[PDB]
């Protein structure tokens, strides 16, 4: 059961494709990756961030989808607006069943990248997993309490995602058309959801298990 992560590389192993692959491995899906950028960083700071060229990113995408296609795909932090479009164009070509978009912005974000994320990537998401500042950047609405989290979440549903998991911080909320759930509370969570959706779990359930998974880790 293949699950793909499309994100940057983090040398510390705390985020990016490393964190996603570790999670896929622990949960039991077969991990695959398209690396979009290389970052040298640790708990003390970022030493360097370097985008990969678009043709090597394209080749990675073709290699993954054209052999054993992934059941579910996670998109993490992609800072290049051009790389975001490249990702969108190819996702529409292969149409993986479940797309999990984690709009990572931490503060590192380009206005044009924000624009592409919102206009083109988000509407394709089965589920989007923004934290509070990401939900604010996306909608331009302040978030003060859970009522504002719920409401901003419903504003985000209007952009196309089938579900929104808003991460507070302290509670998280899952909103969908006929679904509202509160969870007493990052990259691990969205990769964990990707794996459970790929394994055939229903969305509320996949989120249940992902939280439980995090506790142990």
């Amino acid at each position: 059961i293949p699950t793909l992560t499309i994100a940057g590389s983090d040398s510390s192993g705390g985020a990016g494709i490393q964190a996603d692959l570790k999670t896929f491995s622990a949960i039991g899906t077969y991990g695959m990756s398209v690396i979009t950028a290389i970052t040298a960083q640790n708990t003390k700071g970022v030493f360097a961030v370097e985008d990969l060229n678009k043709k090597i990113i394209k080749k990675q995408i073709e290699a993954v989808f054209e052999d054993i296609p992934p059941r579910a795909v996670k998109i993490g932090m992609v800072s290049s607006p051009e790389i975001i479009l490249e990702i969108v164009e190819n996702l529409k070509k292969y149409n993986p069943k479940y797309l999990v978009v984690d709009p990572v912005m931490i503060y590192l974000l380009k206005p044009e990248a924000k624009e592409n994320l919102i206009k083109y990537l988000i509407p394709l998401a089965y589920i989007i997993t923004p934290n509070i500042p990401e939900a604010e950047e996306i909608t331009g609405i302040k978030i003060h309490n859970v009522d504002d989290m719920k409401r901003v979440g419903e504003e985000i549903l209007q952009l196309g995602p089938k579900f929104v998991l808003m991460k507070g911080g302290a509670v998280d909320i899952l909103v969908g058309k006929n679904i509202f759930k509160v969870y007493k509370s990052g990259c691990t969570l969205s990769s964990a959801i990707t794996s459970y959706l790929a394994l055939g779990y229903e969305i509320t359930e996949a989120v249940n298990l992902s939280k439980i998974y995090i506790t142990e880790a």
Copy 2:
């Protein structure tokens, strides 16, 4: 939370390189980190693109990892650029990790060289001598020493020649010979024979060393891991 580092190329299909290493690390229980040296677009049907990263971003990745909470064991996987091999060696001498597991990937199961002459020369002359343990197949052991291997006695003698070059231990993987397949562990004062079976074996050895097992038990547990993985 025991950190283990892998320094190797990325394989999009997730069957090799850092992806395979990170999967093993995670399954065994160590905290995986990686210095990526190259980007490869490939799958079971073939290799579509390979791109070496620049020296500077490799250097920065290494510095980042060693300047915070460093790894308790380090695996070096396949590195195809001669220049990157030298930079990895210079950085490894600066940080001096205790458990350096070098998987000297040079020749495939199918019998093809996987590195050009200069890369191979740099790996053999400068990286291999820093290893705590190396995990060559028979063709690789032959390549390292220039000595032909026809049986297990030869495996042992060539393993011992390899120790004089710097590694404290050699785990020579069998399978290549026409005869009986066995894996042999050789150190200055140990010789042990194991059942024969890759990336998983070297990455699993890295994890068990980091977890606090001495080499012989680390190898032992790695083999049990593989057996359990195969089912």
